[PDB]
Nucleic acid binder design. Structure first.
Lengths: 55, 55
DNA sequence: GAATAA
DNA sequence: GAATAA
């Protein structure tokens, strides 16, 4: 007979404890920025022109 | 098959019968003492003075 | 608070 | 949607 004593012991079933490559981490990129919009200038991006948000 | 007859017999589980160092004995130190308090003297601890209990 | 906590 | 899907 194959028998033995132990604690937190069990007949051995399938164990592969590596995930099958499924895991998800979640960060939020957080980029608060104080900015200025200057239309008072003649230079490049400072003009009467609409300033763009390139989402 | 592994089997045998016996009395007060069991499949063998974990047995270490030494305690993990936890045991408590309790005595009371008992020290009744008849004593005298003498303030009638001039010598050392015999005076008008309060005699002390140094618990 | 089988490994001794009266 | 024992092999990680918060």
């Amino acid at each position: 007979t194959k028998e033995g004593y132990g604690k937190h012991i069990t007949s051995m079933h399938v164990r592969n404890i590596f995930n099958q490559g499924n895991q998800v981490i979640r960060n939020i990129v957080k980029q608060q920025r104080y900015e200025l919009l200057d239309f008072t200038g003649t230079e490049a991006g400072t003009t009467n022109l609409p300033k763009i948000i390139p989402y």
